[PDB]
Amino acid sequence: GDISGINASVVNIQKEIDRLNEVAKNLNESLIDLQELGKYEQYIK
Amino acid sequence: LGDISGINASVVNIQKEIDRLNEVAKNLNESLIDLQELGKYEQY
Amino acid sequence: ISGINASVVNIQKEIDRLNEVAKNLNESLIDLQELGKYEQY
Amino acid sequence: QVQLQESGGGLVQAGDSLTLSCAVSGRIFSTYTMGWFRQAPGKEREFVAAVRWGAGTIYYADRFTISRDSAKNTVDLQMNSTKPEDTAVYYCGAAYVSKANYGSLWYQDSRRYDYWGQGTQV
Amino acid sequence: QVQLQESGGGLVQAGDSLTLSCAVSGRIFSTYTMGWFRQAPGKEREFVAAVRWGAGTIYYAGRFTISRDSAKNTVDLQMNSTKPEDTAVYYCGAAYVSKANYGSLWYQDSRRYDYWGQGTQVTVSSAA
Amino acid sequence: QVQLQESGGGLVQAGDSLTLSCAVSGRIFSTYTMGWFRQAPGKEREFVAAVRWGAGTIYYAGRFTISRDSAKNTVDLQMNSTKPEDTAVYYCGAAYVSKANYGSLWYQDSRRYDYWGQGTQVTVSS
Ligand SMILES: [Cl-]
C-alpha cells in the first residue's frame, strides 16, 4: 500500500502516453506523404 | 475515499487512451501494409 | 488497492507493447522511404 | 492510374429500380476501394457504399446494393425503390490503398478517394 | 529526382538585406520540403528555415524570411539587416517526403534531406 | 523484383558438408532480406537463416552458416556435419523491404517473403 506512489506511477504513465501520441502523429505524417507520392508511381503487375 | 476515487478515474481514463492508441496502431499498420503490397509492383 | 496496482502493471505492459509496435512501424517505414528515392512516376 | 466511367442514369419514376455501373480502366490492384457517392445540386458529396476490390468487403452508409465484377472490372450500384430525395449526380471514386490511417470510417469521406468519374445523373 | 541551384550570394554591407534563391529542377511533388542551412567558420551546419512545398508551412530556427514560388519552382531566403555572424556558405536542400518519423524536429537535421545545392558564399562586410 | 535460382543440393553422406547457393538476379536493393527455409515430410516450412542484403546482418534459428556475396549476387547456406534429420526441400526467399511491422520475428515467417527459388532436395543418407 504505497499510498502515493500510485499517483506518481499514473503521472508517469500519462507521460508515456503523451510520447506515444507524438510518435503516432509523426508516423502518420510520414505515411501520408508516401500515400500522396504513391498516386503518381508506376505500378505494373 | 476521494483518494481512491481519484485514482480509479485516472486509471479508467488511461485505459481509454490506450484503447484509442491501439486502434491508431492497427490503422497505421493497415495503411502501411497496402503500400508494401503495391510497392513490389513499382518500376524503379 | 491491489486491483489498482494490478491495473497499473497491466497498463505498463500495454504501453510496452505499443512502444515496440511504433519501433517496428518506423523500421518498415524507413525502408519504403529509402526505396522511394529510386521510383518511376 | 485508373479512369472511371459511370453509366445507367437518367429519368425514373419513384418506386422504380435502377442500376448504375462504373467501368474501371487502367491498372486495378487488390488494395483498391471503390465507392459510390452522390451530389445533389448545391449540396455536398454524400457517401452511398464502398467495396474493397481484393477481398470484396462491402460497406454501406448507416435500399442500395453495391457489387463489383472483377472479371469485367466494374462496380455496380443497384438502386431499389427510387425516392425523390435520390435525385443527384452519382459519382464513382477509387482510393488506391487503404486510408485507414485517417480513421476506421475513412472510406465514407470522399476526400480520401484518388480518382473520380464524371458522374451520371439520376 | 530533383536538382538544386543556389544563386544570389556574394558581398553585402552590414545592415543591408540580401536574397538567396534556389532553382529547383526535375520532378517536384507537394510532399517536398525545402530547407536552407548555413555553414559558418568553426561551426556545424546550422538550420535556418524550411518550407513545405505543397501547403506552404514554414519553420524557422527573425531576420530571415523563407518563401517558395511554385510557379517558377524556386525557394528564396531573404536576409534582412545582415550581421557579421551571417557570413557563411548557404545550402539549399530538399527532402522528398516528410521524415517526421525521425522526430518532430526532423527538418532541422541535414541528414534527413535527400538532395543538395552546391552552396553559395555570403560575406558580410562591416566597412564604413 | 528479383529472381532466385537455387543450386547445390542433392544426396550427401551424413557427416559431410554441403553448400546450397541461391543466385539473385534483377533489381536488388539494400532493403532486401534473403532467407533460407526448409520443408521435410511430415513437418511445416521451417525457418533456417536470413541475411539483410545491404548491412549484412545475419539471423539464425550453429551447424549452418548463411552468407551473401554482393559481388557475385548470391546467398549461400553452408551445411556442415549433416545429419539425417536435415533431409528436406530447401527454399531461398527474398523480402523486398523489412516487414518488421508484422512483429520482430517477421523474418521467420515465410508469408513475409515476396520471391522464392524453386526449392532443392537435400538427402542425407546412411
Ligand atoms: Cl482532407
Interchain pair B29, F1: CB under 8 A: no
Contact list, B19 vs chain C (CB under 8 Å) = none
Question: Measured in angstroms, how far is the CA atom of residue D110 from the centroid of ligand 1?
Answer: 9
* CA atoms of D65 and E94, how far apart (whole Å): 47
Q: Which residues of D15-54 are buried (b: 16+ CB within 10 A; e: fewer)?
A: eeebebbbebeeebbebbbbbbbbeeeeeebebbbbbbbe
* Spatial distance between the Cα atoms of A42 and A31, rounded to a whole number of angstroms: 19
Neighbouring residues of the ion ligand 1, judged by CB less than 5 Å: D 111
Tell me how many residue pairs between chain A and chain E have CB atoms under 8 A apart: 29
User: In C, which residues are within 8 Å of E96 by CB distance?
Assistant: 36-37
- The answer to whether the beta carbons of residues D53 and D33 sit under 8 Å apart is yes
Put simply, the answer to whether D98 touches B30 (Cβ < 8 Å) is: yes
Q: For residue E66, give Cα distances in angstroms to E39, E48, E92.
A: 17, 9, 11
Record: contact C28-F100, CB cut-off 8 A: yes
Full strand arrangement of the beta sheet holding F2-7: F2-7, F18-26, F74-79, F64-69
Out of 3.90.1150.10, 2.60.40.10, 2.40.420.20, 2.60.120.260, select the CATH number for domain E2-125: 2.60.40.10
Chain D residues with CB-CB distance to B23 below 8 A: 104
Pairing of strands F88-95, F115-116: antiparallel
Q: Do A29 and E107 touch, CB atoms closer than 8 A?
A: no
Torsion of CA A12, A15, A17, A22, to 10 degrees: -160
Q: In this complex, which of A22, A30, A37 lies closest to E29 when CB atoms are compared?
A: A37
Segment 11-30 of chain C within 8 Å of chain B by CB? 11, 14-15, 18, 21-22, 25, 28-29
Experimentally determined by? X-ray
Fold of D2-121: Immunoglobulin-like (2.60.40)
Enter the C-alpha cell of residue C10: 497491466
- The reply to whether residue F31 touches residue C35, judged by beta carbons under 8 angstroms, is yes
Between CA E66 and CA E77 the distance in angstroms is: 5
> Bridge partners of D49?
D36, D60
Q: Which residues of chain C lie closer than 8 angstroms to F29, CB-CB? A: 34-35, 38
DSSP state, residue F81: S
- All three cell numbers of B35: 503500400
Of D31, D96, D101, the CB nearest to B27: D101
Report how far residue C36's alpha carbon sits from residue E27's, in angstroms, rounded to the nearest whole number: 13
To one decimal place, what's the resolution in Å? Answer: 1.9
The closest CB to that of A27, out of B14, B28, B43, belongs to B28
**SS3 annotation, chain A:** CCCCHHHHHHHHHHHHHHHHHHHHHHHHHHHHHHHHHHCCCCECC
The alpha-carbon gap from F60 to the nearest alpha carbon of chain C, in Å, equals 20
Ligand 1: centre distance to CA D109 (Å): 8
C41 CB near a chain E CB, below 8 Å?
yes
- Answer whether B19 touches D (CB < 8 Å): no
Query: Nearest by CB to E97, which of C26, C36, C41?
Result: C36
The 3-class secondary structure across D65-82, one letter per residue, is EEEEECCCCEEEEEECCC
